[PDB]
Structures are given as structure tokens and as C-alpha cells.
Amino acid sequence: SGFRKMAFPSGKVEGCMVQVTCGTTTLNGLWLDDVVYCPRHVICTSEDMLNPNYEDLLIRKSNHNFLVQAGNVQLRVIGHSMQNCVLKLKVDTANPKTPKYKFVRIQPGQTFSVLACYNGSPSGVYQCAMRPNFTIKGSFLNGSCGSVGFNIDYDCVSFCYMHHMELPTGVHAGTDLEGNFYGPFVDRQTAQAAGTDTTITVNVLAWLYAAVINGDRWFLNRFTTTLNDFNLVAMKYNYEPLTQDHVDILGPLSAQTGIAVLDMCASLKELLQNGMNGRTILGSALLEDEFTPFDVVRQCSGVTFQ
Amino acid sequence: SGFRKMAFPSGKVEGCMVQVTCGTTTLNGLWLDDVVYCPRHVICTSEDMLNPNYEDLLIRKSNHNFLVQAGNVQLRVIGHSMQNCVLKLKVDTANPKTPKYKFVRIQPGQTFSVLACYNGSPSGVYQCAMRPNFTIKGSFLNGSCGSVGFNIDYDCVSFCYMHHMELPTGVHAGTDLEGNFYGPFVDRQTAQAAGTDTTITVNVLAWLYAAVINGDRWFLNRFTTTLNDFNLVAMKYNYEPLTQDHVDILGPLSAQTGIAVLDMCASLKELLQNGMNGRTILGSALLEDEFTPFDVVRQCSGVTFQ
Numbered sequence A, B: 001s002g003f004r005k006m007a008f009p010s011g012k013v014e015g016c017m018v019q020v021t022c023g024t025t026t027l028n029g030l031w032l033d034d035v036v037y038c039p040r041h042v043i044c045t046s047e048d049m050l051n052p053n054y055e056d057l058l059i060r061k062s063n064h065n066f067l068v069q070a071g072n073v074q075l076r077v078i079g080h081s082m083q084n085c086v087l088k089l090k091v092d093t094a095n096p097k098t099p100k101y102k103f104v105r106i107q108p109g110q111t112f113s114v115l116a117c118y119n120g121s122p123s124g125v126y127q128c129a130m131r132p133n134f135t136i137k138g139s140f141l142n143g144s145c146g147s148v149g150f151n152i153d154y155d156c157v158s159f160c161y162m163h164h165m166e167l168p169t170g171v172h173a174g175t176d177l178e179g180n181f182y183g184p185f186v187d188r189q190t191a192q193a194a195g196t197d198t199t200i201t202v203n204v205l206a207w208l209y210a211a212v213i214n215g216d217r218w219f220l221n222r223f224t225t226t227l228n229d230f231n232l233v234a235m236k237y238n239y240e241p242l243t244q245d246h247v248d249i250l251g252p253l254s255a256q257t258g259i260a261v262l263d264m265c266a267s268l269k270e271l272l273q274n275g276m277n278g279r280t281i282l283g284s285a286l287l288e289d290e291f292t293p294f295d296v297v298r299q300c301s302g303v304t305f306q
Helices: A054-059 A201-213 A229-236 A244-249 A251-257 A261-274 A293-301 B054-059 B201-213 B229-236 B244-249 B251-257 B261-274 B293-301
Strands: A017-022 A025-032 A035-039 A067-070 A073-075 A077-083 A086-091 A101-103 A111-118 A121-129 A148-153 A156-166 A172-175 B017-022 B025-032 B035-039 B067-070 B073-075 B077-083 B086-091 B101-103 B111-118 B121-129 B148-153 B156-166 B172-175
Touching: A017 A035, A017 A121, A025 A067, A035 A156, A054 A077, A111 A156, A201 A244, A201 A251, A201 A261, A201 A293, A229 A261, A244 A251, A251 A261, A251 A293, B017 B035, B017 B121, B025 B067, B035 B156, B054 B077, B111 B156, B201 B244, B201 B251, B201 B261, B201 B293, B229 B261, B244 B251, B251 B261, B251 B293
Parallel strands: A101 A156, B101 B156
Antiparallel strands: A017 A025, A017 A067, A025 A035, A035 A086, A067 A073, A077 A086, A111 A121, A111 A148, A148 A156, A156 A172, B017 B025, B017 B067, B025 B035, B035 B086, B067 B073, B077 B086, B111 B121, B111 B148, B148 B156, B156 B172
């Protein structure tokens, strides 16, 4: 029993992290086979970031200006290519610790583990969600660019995120592994606005089910509601609307606990309009939205991986 | 910027987890060199746990009744010994992935990472603290016994905890790697009482400093206080008393932020006696006590490990 914000075991990712330097700048890279993936602004100085012309900047660099380091062994850059906002540094030796991997672009509301790195060396791992406004509220210091987010499907590692920038508002933006930014952000040091951030309603409902599984039952109310009335309340509190796809996803949770998805919504509606009044759920005074329905099933059933 | 409950990278521990079976029972073991460490109640059935005589139980077993599995490769038990509540299963081949490691017994209030495992296979990693009453509020399902807690001092892994039991109150108890239980618990299925659980005051103060470092400043009050007056307030809210050793530990945080340790206590005292009134600190509506002063320095300075 019990519930925790669990991250994926990081060992398969640790062996893939390398240190990349172009000039003075040092950030992290992902060493898969004979290619190193890293943010393209490694070729920039602090001056270039205010208005970079990446095409012109990269042309002044050559394969010899890139120093990719893995521990105390140095890799030789045999070729470089720019794919969107990511740089593909081809080297001569394939990574012996290359795992079965996949590149995926996740949707807002999905969760993943971030392996925070500095100078190519792991420092810690934590679980987070992609906000509906395509940002992440992580912990990134200077030099942590190039740290990757990932999920683990048993034996296959699914890389979904590479960190690029901290916005002036202190939130973090990045790309998929093809270099396409999540959200309307560009890799340039200018004021960039993220959208209004909403609460991931389907995630909150799955967390309420986890509370029921682990003994927290006081919020189970005496009312019910419909999928049109609840969304009316949800919109007022900046909650994202619930669809029938979300109801279908919560099905196994409803079957395991005996509480209908619509019934749990009425419980949440009362929580929204009347607060929690000094009481906690699973040790929290706030409604939690960084657990997906799949995360709850994984932790409550104890699925393992390679 | 930003703050997260970060766990240590788990790769060095993943290569040490094996599956141990004696009869029907299956739990996890720690494969270091040519010894496998696992809870001694692996030799028990569900019936034996109500009143086990471990000496008599182990005598009926022999080296051939232990099946230690690592992935799809099986280890041969060449010898067994019982040290307190842990079983030392000596095998024939040393673990090639054995890291530089240490056995440590931590104190209450210290933090560590748990690698939750089932059937010898990793499932997830999370950070937690040893409560003052020597329990941990983790996430352990059936078969997760033998999962280990650890810290990483750059290149050396410090194993400090092995999970043994879930108390009837849903909290979790375990031992050090020499098999000595944390707290007054025995490995037997009987009603066992943990002490009153208090809040780790020095941890809360370090977290307040982290809030100041990351921009949360509203709680900085206009009063001050002394180390005898604050403990008077702390005792009323089940907060553990602050000593001069705790003040010395918070020194670098005070120097980095310019706020005296005694001044921050007066801020906390007001938070205790008057609440937080619908406001949050670092995204939390509750006062957090599972960050040590060392954790805050590590995350705010970005220290890395082997």
C-alpha cells in the first residue's frame, strides 16, 4: 500500500549521456548508436542567443570544433547535421550501451521521467507531466540543457523530451528528439509567452481512484452528475474538459473500485466548489494532476521492466 | 531554477537486484560480490509469519532449497548464514556489476532513494525520509520485500535500508544491511506500534531556504526569536526541537541567502501558529520535511556523481 510520485529506473539512460562542447559552451548530449543528439544552441555564445541565425552560425563550425566527452573517453565527431532545433553529431564508434529505444512525441497531460544531468553526468531523476500549455515545471540549472525525458515500456526506452530553455517566468521548454519544440517556443533569448495553464482533469480523477484504493474515502459524496454539467463547473476553475475518451480510459479503475466514472466526477465537483477544508488526500492538501490513469494502474499493480 | 523531490540515479543499484525463492515465497535480494542479501522471512510461509522461530526454520533448509535468479541466469547457493534479520546467501560467481559500495545506518530525518522491485526486477525509484519514529511512508506491494534504499556519494553507493514489512497501519518498516531493524519492530505478523511521528524541523527550515532561493519570499516575516522560544512553539505542533548542531548545518544556506537561521525560525513560528491561509510555498500547501539541508545544497548547486 501507499502512493508515491515514482520515476522510472534510469540505468538504461545513464549510459547514453555524454558531454558536448563547442567553444566555451558545455551541455549534455544523448549518445545512441553512432549519433549524438544535443540542442543546436550549443554553437551559440551568450551574445548569439539574443538573435541567433543558426544556419549562418553552424556554417562557421566544422566537425573539428565539437568535443563530445563520455566520462574520460573522447568521441570523434565525423559528421554534423541540423534537424530543426536539434544537432546530430555523427561519431565513429557506436555506443555499446545503446538500449532498445524509440522516439515519441507525447501529448499534453502525459507523464515522463527526467534525468537531470550536468557536464554529461547524471545528478537526479524525477517524474513530471507535460502541462496543457506545453511547458514543464522542472528543476534545471545552467548547463542542464540536453537532459532528456523518457518513458520505459518494459524493454524499450521511449525518449520524448530534450530540455532547451528556461523561460523568463522560470518554467522550462524543450523539444522532441526530432527537434520540434513542444508549444510555440523558439530557441532564442527573448520574452516568450506560454498559454494559460489548466489542470489535467483526467489525471486528477485517476488520483482520486488511487486514494480510494489506498483507503482515503471521505470525498466520496452523495450526489451524481453528467458529462455536460461537470465540464461546466470544470471550465470555471481552469480544468480541462472531460471527453468520452477520458471516461473510457478510466474504465478499469472504475471496475476495480466499484465507483462509476460519473459518480467520481460529482465528488470532484464538490471538491472544486467547496474546497478541501483543511483535510488531505494521499498526504496532499491540493488536487494532484501529474498521475495518468496508466501510472496509477502501474503502481497499484506493480508492473516491472527489463 | 525550480524545485523537485529528486531521487538518485538508480543504474548502479539496478544491476545488483536478484530474485530469491525458498519454497513458494519470492522476494528481492541484493547481489554484491559473491553474497546475496535478503530478508530472512523468505524461508517463511504465510502460516509461519504469525509466530516464526527462525533458528528452527532455517535449520530445516539447506543450500539447495534457495533459488536465486538474476534475469534469465541462475546463481548457485554455495552457503547461507543468518545475520540478525538478514540472510547471507553465498553464491559461486561474484557480481560483475558490483559497484563501489558501503553499508551505513542512517539517523532519523535523513533522506534516501528507494528502488522498488518485484520478482528481482526494478519498477520505479522515489525519494523519501526516515521518519523520527523509524518508519517510512513508501509504496510497497506484495513481493517488494528486499527492495533497498541507498544514497550515492559521487562514486560510492551507500546502502542504508532493506524493506521487510508493512505494518497493519499501512506504514513500512525495515532494517539496515546488517539486518538490525530501524525502530522497535520485529519481523513477525503481529500488531506493532510505531511511536508518535513528529515533523523534522531542520528539514522544513532548509526547504524554506530553497523557497527563498527560487523566489518565494512572502513568508519572510518582521519578527525574530530565540532557540528556546521557538522550541516551545515547536513542541506544541509535534515538531522536533532544534539544536545548535541543526543551526550549524544550516549555516551555508544562511550565508547564501542573507537570512539568519534564527530569523527564519520566526517566519516558521508564524506559519505554525497562523497557518498558510490558502497560499503555497514551492507549489505546496503543506510544510515539507523530506528535504535535508544537504539535499537543498545538492539540487541548488547541481552536484553530479559517477
